Amino acid sequence: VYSYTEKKRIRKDFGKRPQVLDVPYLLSIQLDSFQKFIEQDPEGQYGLE
Amino acid sequence: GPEEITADIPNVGEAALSKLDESGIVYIGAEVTGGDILVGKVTPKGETQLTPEEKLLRAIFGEKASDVKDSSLRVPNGVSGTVIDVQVFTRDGVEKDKRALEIEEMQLKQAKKDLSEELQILEAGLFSRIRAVLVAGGVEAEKLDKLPRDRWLELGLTDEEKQNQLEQLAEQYDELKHEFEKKLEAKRRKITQGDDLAPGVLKIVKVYLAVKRRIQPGDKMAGRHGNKGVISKINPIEDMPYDENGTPV
Amino acid sequence: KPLVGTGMERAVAVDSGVTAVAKRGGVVQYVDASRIVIKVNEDEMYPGEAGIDIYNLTKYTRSNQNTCINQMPCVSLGEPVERGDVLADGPSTDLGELAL
Amino acid sequence: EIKELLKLGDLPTSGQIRLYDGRTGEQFERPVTVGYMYMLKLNHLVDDKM
Amino acid sequence: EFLKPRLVDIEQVSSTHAKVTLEPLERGFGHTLGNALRRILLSSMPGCAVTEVEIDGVLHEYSTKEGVQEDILEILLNLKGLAVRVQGKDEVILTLNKSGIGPVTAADITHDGDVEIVKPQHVICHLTDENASISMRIKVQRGRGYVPASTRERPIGRLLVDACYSPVERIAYNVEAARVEQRTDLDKLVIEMETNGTIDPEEAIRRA
Amino acid sequence: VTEFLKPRLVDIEQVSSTHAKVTLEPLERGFGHTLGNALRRILLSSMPGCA
Amino acid sequence: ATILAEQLEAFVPEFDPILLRPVDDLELTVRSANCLKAEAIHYIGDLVQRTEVELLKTPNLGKKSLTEIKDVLASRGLSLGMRLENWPPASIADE
Amino acid sequence: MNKEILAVVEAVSNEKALPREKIFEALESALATATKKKYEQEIDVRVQIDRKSGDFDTFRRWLVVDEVTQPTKEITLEAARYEDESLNLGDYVEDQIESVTFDRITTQTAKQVIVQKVREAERA
Amino acid sequence: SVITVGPYLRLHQCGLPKKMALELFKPFIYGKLELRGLATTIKAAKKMVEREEAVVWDILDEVIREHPVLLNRAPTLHRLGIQAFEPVLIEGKAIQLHPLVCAAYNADFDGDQMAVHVPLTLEAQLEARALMMSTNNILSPANGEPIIVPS
Ligand SMILES: [Mg+2]
């Protein structure tokens, strides 16, 4: 099945290897690191803590 | 003394000042050339003598000697454009001129309309929820739109999840009312207040020119494989190699 | 658009922050060059805080490299949208793809 | 696969169309390669360096 | 004693494009008149494109109007692609008024006594509210070639679009052998043009 | 709109004998090639004679 | 050139619609428009028939508003005191 | 300001041996011309300088005519007599307008007209 | 500015834009304008070329004629990286540089930039024509091999 904006213009796709892990969220280094920095969590674990 | 942003300036012919308003700042939309005046600022003042006729300015105008010299900060060339957006920031205490009050009324009007449309649109969604809940359980097909729309709660319906949900939506609605009051007061405060700025500056005028650069011999185009290149000649349509269908490359 | 892409355009477009990705799916109510109003479907919706979302697009403003970071609405009116889907194309995007 | 997709359209198999000239109006010998390439404008313009 | 070309058949196979036919021609003149008339027809033919637009509540072309899902710049591109014929004037001013939910097609222009739209299904923009209406004035004039905005506005409310005064799109000649005349070594010149509807094909070959 | 830059032979620098060099100006941004090509193709063959 | 040219010889009174407009379309000051409406002057054709001396008798019409009316009429190529034969046309007498 | 007009008139009268009256008439004409240039419409303008204070009043004027060809400079006899019943054909109706601020523009125009009158009278 | 090809030129001349030509040759244009008698003071001439009227382009085609310029690639390694040309004016904003000469400058056309310098005095015009002209540099000084080899 396809999403409704994927029924607008469905891109022809060559390619042979069936994928098993999709592309992750490409900005996870910045967001995950700064979420690790500023987050209410003691035990001396969070950046400021 | 401090500087002047007003358009009261000598030397400049009407040919310069036709593209400024009555308070120095260029209009929003005035398509300018390279080297016109956007903001008028009488400032570089060294020394200028006064003849009997220049001394007569003290009588009608009132100015002692028109500062000391006369020259309006005019801007350089190289770029065209169309002024799309003008910002005026004022350090607090300084007299707002007429165009800064025009921008203040404009942004007050925009933020007023925007928060009022937030309340209207979310109230429309809330009333659509009330209509969706009252499809069943004491439905009134004709009696629903005889009364004003803000009272859709005291209709015939017992203590169920639906009267509980209408009470929760009344909580949400009164929250939106008092929240709209306090947020419009805070937004009038944010528009009306001054801004902390540099040491010894009166007001900052920012003007956004919007050039539209097309293409010409000398730009750099490239594909996605490393095939660079300066475009060297923009040929006519007829000179292009065409094929046996008719289309030029 | 790219006629010959790699299928990686949608990850670079959606997983960046230039397009206006829908938060909760539903039915579009009002499209405009300024704003877009989504009416949230009932099988995705909170009980309180009745809720129809408003996306205020970012019209013509200055980027850092003196380009023109625009957002254009690409949805029609009355159109269904799903959770996780483009509503407004950004600069160098088209229907959620990446058109440089 | 490119050949089989160029066969679905009625294009020539080798990808090369014979092309005429615009000036002379007479044919280029040894038929040339045409197609679509996706080209980018870079922001090293010429009325920013001159 | 060279045989002279005379137009024989004008096959208007579709509404945009036609196939004019020259007969007869001595050998060598086929490619000569073909390339020559192709280059004249693509070079300089009198078209009838648009120059100025003044939308009512719009200051500069980079703004946005309340109640239309396209920018003012996209409205200018869609009006730049407008295919229009004028008959007895140098320039002319067309007026557009439209109010209500839905498209603003090119048939919503209040036509004058000589202006004729040739493709009335052309979309300009989409109005998207019950009381949100555009009301513009369009300026359409004659010309020749491609006259951009940078070469050639006095108030701040005018908007200048580029001017592609060019009616034809694709001119393709295909020379071929002739058999109508008993004499052999004669040629036929068959020119398939591609007009946008603003120019009659025999008028195009006559002006070329 | 039908008014072009009507040209003329500004000079005929006939170099030596049985050889001329005829320059024509001004033409449009594209008519030099069409008149050069038309006159070149016609002189080459169409032009009659005896041999 | 002679060969190529020989191979191409087979080719080669009506009332002005401005008078029928209302006085409000003249972009007059709110004062001038309200002074003209008080004297039952509805159309540009009614205004153009009145003399300058008649307009100065109108209650609250000042010298400044009279100059504004002249400058606006002059911008449209009209002058005060033109006699129109057969004004108003029977198409206007029924409103 | 006030006393400065008298000091300028006295300095120029003594240095150029010129009648003060001729300098004032010319300054009035200079100021009238400078005023006319600030209006988009062609108006007629009279300026009057007070000879003791150096204060000046600016009047827009209209010529009283039978048929008005120029509404910016002409008024009908019927309209002129509505303001003053004593007016005849060929008289002027005068409205007091805002006097042009004496900026360095008017100052430069006044200087040019003074230099011209000085030259005209040196020549005589 | 950025360079581009222009293959109609000869090795002795290069294309030079009109905007750069009117900026680099402001004093020669001032001197030419003051000689004719069109203006009087220097200010008038600076207003004329600030406005760019219809008569200063003929003045410009008078001063450009027979006046060489020094084109220079930015990493100049040997002496063939400064060569003197005669300008031919260009509608455009890019220096048109004759292609054979490119093999001397190590100049491709992938975004390269070159500097133009004007020999002011008369001995410098003669040194640009008689020593540094591009017709005079047809052999590389490192050996006997021709440097105007077709690339
Ligand atoms: Mg390089």
Tell me the C-alpha distance between E190 and E173, whole Å. 6
Tell me the C-alpha distance between C97 and C23, whole Å. 18
Same domain, B105 and B161: yes
DSSP 3-state of C81: strand
How many CA atoms within 13 Å lie on the side-chain side of H3? 0
DSSP 3-state of H87: coil
Residues of H in contact with B8 (CB under 8 A): 101, 103
Contact (Cβ atoms closer than 8 angstroms) between residue G82 and residue G19: no
- Residue C75: CB atoms within 10 A of its CB come to 24
Residue type (1 letter), E101: I
- DSSP 3-state helix, strand, coil percentages of chain G (rounded to 5)? 45, 0, 55
Residue with the two structure tokens 């196939």: E19
Give all strands (DSSP E) within E29-101, no chain letters. Answer: 46-47, 50-55, 84-85, 91-99
Q: Tell me, what CATH number does B15's domain have?
A: 2.40.50.150
- Residue E141: CB atoms within 10 A of its CB come to 19
CA distances from E203 to B191, E84, E207 (A): 64, 17, 6
Contact (Cβ atoms closer than 8 angstroms) between residue I100 and residue I24: no
Contact (Cβ atoms closer than 8 angstroms) between residue C61 and residue C49: no
Bridge partners for E137 per DSSP: E54, E95
Q: At what angle do helices I56-63 and I26-36 cross, to 10 degrees?
A: 110
Tell me the C-alpha distance between C34 and G72, whole Å. 39
Which candidate from D28, D34, D42 shows the least CB-CB separation from B221? D42
Tell me the C-alpha distance between E103 and E83, whole Å. 18
CA of residue E105 to ligand 1 center, whole Å = 51
DSSP string, G53-90: HHHTTSTT--HHHHHHHHHHHHHTT--TTPPPTTPSPT
Tell me the C-alpha distance between B241 and B247, whole Å. 9
Name the token pair of H65. Answer: 């005519």
Contact (Cβ atoms closer than 8 angstroms) between residue E30 and residue E99: no
Q: Tell me, what CATH number does B103's domain have?
A: 6.10.140.1670
Contact (Cβ atoms closer than 8 angstroms) between residue E196 and residue E167: yes
Bridge partners for E177 per DSSP: E187
Name the token pair of I58. Answer: 């003929």
Tell me the C-alpha distance between G41 and G56, whole Å. 14
- Residue B124: CB atoms within 10 A of its CB come to 16
Same domain, B71 and B89: yes
Same domain, B32 and B60: yes
Resolution (A): 4.5
Provide the residue count of chain B: 249
Contact (Cβ atoms closer than 8 angstroms) between residue I29 and residue I60: yes
Tell me the C-alpha distance between D15 and D31, whole Å. 10
Name the token pair of E165. Answer: 């005064």
Tell me the C-alpha distance between H57 and E64, whole Å. 49
- The angle subtended at Cα G67 by Cα G64 and Cα G72, nearest 5°, is 125
Contact (Cβ atoms closer than 8 angstroms) between residue E177 and residue E1: no
Domain with B140 in it: 95-194
Q: How many CB pairs under 8 A join F and G?
A: 7
DSSP 3-state of E134: strand
Cis upstream peptide for F26 (omega within 30°): yes
Burial class (CB in 10 A: 0-12, 13-18, 19+), B94: middle
CA of residue I109 to ligand 1 center, whole Å = 6
Question: CB distance D50–I111 less than 8 Å?
Answer: no
> In chain H, what are the domains?
4-124 (3.30.1480.10)
DSSP string, I95-133: EE--HHHHHHHT--SSS-BEEEE---SHHHHHHHHHTSB
CA distances from B161 to B172, F39, I78 (A): 16, 94, 90
Same domain, B171 and B142: yes
DSSP 3-state of C44: helix
Nearest Cα neighbor of H97 from G67, E76, C94, B158 is: G67
Mutate to test the interface with D, among B77, B80, B213, B216 (most CBs of D within 10 A): B213
- Sign of the CA dihedral with C38 first, then C40, C44, and C48 last: positive
Nearest Cα neighbor of B28 from A9, E168, I5, E63 is: E63
Q: Residues of I comprising the binding site? A: 108, 110, 112
- Sign of the CA dihedral with I113 first, then I119, I123, and I125 last: positive
Centroid of chain to Cα G84: 12
Contact (Cβ atoms closer than 8 angstroms) between residue I29 and residue I44: no
Residues of B in contact with C68 (CB under 8 A): 210
Phi, psi for H64 (deg, rounded to 5)? -75, 115
Phi, psi for E107 (deg, rounded to 5)? -85, 0
- DSSP 3-state helix, strand, coil percentages of chain C (rounded to 5)? 10, 35, 60
Smallest Cα distance from F40 to chain D, Å: 10
CA of residue D48 to ligand 1 center, whole Å = 18
Chains G and B touch (3+ CB pairs under 8 A): no
Mutate to test the interface with D, among C1, C63, C68, C100 (most CBs of D within 10 A): C100
Three-state secondary structure of chain B: CCCECCCCCCCCCHHHHCCECCCCEECCCCEECCCCCCECCECCCCCCCCCHHHHCHHHHCCCCCCCCCCCECCCCCCCCEEEEEEEEEECCCCCCCHHHHHHHHHHHHHHHHHHHHHHHHHHHHHHHHHHHHCCCCCCCCCHHHCCCCCCCCCCCCCCCHHHHHHHHHHHHHHHHHHHHHHHHHHHHHHHHCCCCCCCCCCEEEEEEECCCCCCCCCCEEECCCCCCCECCCCCCCCCCCEECCCCEC
Contact (Cβ atoms closer than 8 angstroms) between residue I97 and residue I72: no
Tell me the C-alpha distance between E20 and E193, whole Å. 8
Name the token pair of C58. Answer: 């970012």
* Chain G residue closest in CA terms to E28: G4
Question: CB distance C50–B168 less than 8 Å?
Answer: no
| Residues in CB range of C49: below 8 A, 6 or more apart | B172
Tell me the C-alpha distance between C70 and C18, whole Å. 9
Q: How many helices (H) and strands (E) does chain A have?
A: 1, 0
Which technique? cryo-EM
Tell me the C-alpha distance between B6 and H86, whole Å. 45
Q: Which CATH architecture has domain E47-165?
A: Beta Complex (2.170)
Question: CB distance E31–D22 less than 8 Å?
Answer: no
Cis upstream peptide for G88 (omega within 30°): yes
How many CA atoms within 13 Å lie on the side-chain side of B169? 26
- The angle subtended at Cα E22 by Cα E16 and Cα E26, nearest 5°, is 150
Tell me the C-alpha distance between E39 and E208, whole Å. 9
Tell me the C-alpha distance between I73 and I89, whole Å. 20
Tell me the C-alpha distance between H87 and C25, whole Å. 81
Name the token pair of D18. Answer: 């014979």
Bridge partners for E47 per DSSP: E143
Tell me the C-alpha distance between B225 and B17, whole Å. 52
Same domain, B166 and B108: yes
DSSP 3-state of E45: coil
CB of D40 within 8 Å of a chain B CB? The answer is yes
- Sign of the CA dihedral with I100 first, then I105, I110, and I116 last: negative
Nearest Cα neighbor of E86 from E164, E145, E146, E143 is: E143
Contact (Cβ atoms closer than 8 angstroms) between residue E161 and residue E136: no
Smallest Cα distance from D10 to chain E, Å: 19
Name the token pair of A11. Answer: 């891109």
DSSP 3-state of H23: helix
- Residue B29: CB atoms within 10 A of its CB come to 18
Nearest Cα neighbor of E52 from E104, E94, E112, E106 is: E94
Strands E186-192, E172-177: parallel, antiparallel or unpaired by DSSP? antiparallel
Name the token pair of E3. Answer: 């045989």
Tell me the C-alpha distance between F11 and F24, whole Å. 8
Same domain, B84 and B109: no
Domain with C62 in it: 18-92
Residue type (1 letter), H14: N
- Sign of the CA dihedral with D22 first, then D27, D32, and D36 last: positive
Tell me the C-alpha distance between I129 and E44, whole Å. 44
Tell me the C-alpha distance between E54 and E156, whole Å. 10
Tell me the C-alpha distance between E189 and E168, whole Å. 19
Smallest Cα distance from D34 to chain F, Å: 24
Strands E116-117, E163-165: parallel, antiparallel or unpaired by DSSP? unpaired
Chains F and E touch (3+ CB pairs under 8 A): yes
Q: At what angle do helices I42-51 and I26-36 cross, to 10 degrees?
A: 120
Tell me the C-alpha distance between B175 and B168, whole Å. 10
Question: CB distance E71–C33 less than 8 Å?
Answer: yes
Smallest Cα distance from C65 to chain A, Å: 21
Tell me the C-alpha distance between I9 and I98, whole Å. 6
Q: What is the location of CATH 2.170.120.12 in chain E?
A: 47-165
Q: Which CATH architecture has domain E1-46+166-208?
A: 2-Layer Sandwich (3.30)
- Residue B66: CB atoms within 10 A of its CB come to 21
CA of residue I88 to ligand 1 center, whole Å = 23
Long-range contacts of H112-120, Cβ-Cβ distance < 8 Å, separation of 24 or more = H112/H30, H113/H26, H113/H27, H113/H29, H113/H30, H114/B52, H114/B53, H114/H12, H114/H23, H114/H26, H114/H27, H114/H30, H116/H26, H117/H18, H117/H22, H117/H23, H117/H26, H118/H16, H118/H18
DSSP 3-state of A28: helix
Tell me the C-alpha distance between A29 and A17, whole Å. 28
Burial class (CB in 10 A: 0-12, 13-18, 19+), B125: buried
Same domain, B184 and B132: yes
Three-state secondary structure of F1-51: CCCCCCCEEEEECCCCCCCCCEEEECCCCCHHHHHHHHHHHHHHHHCCCCC
Tell me the C-alpha distance between B63 and B4, whole Å. 14
Tell me the C-alpha distance between E168 and F36, whole Å. 24
| Neighbors of chain C with 3 or more C-beta pairs under 8 Å | A, B, D, E
- Dihedral through CA B106, CA B111, CA B114, CA B115, nearest 10? -150
Residue type (1 letter), B13: G
Q: Tell me, what CATH number does C35's domain have?
A: 2.40.50.100
| Residues in CB range of B226: below 8 A, 6 or more apart | none
- Residue G87: CB atoms within 10 A of its CB come to 16
Question: CB distance D36–C3 less than 8 Å?
Answer: yes
Strands E102-105, C68-69: parallel, antiparallel or unpaired by DSSP? unpaired
DSSP 3-state of E112: coil
Contact (Cβ atoms closer than 8 angstroms) between residue I57 and residue I108: no
Question: CB distance E144–F1 less than 8 Å?
Answer: yes
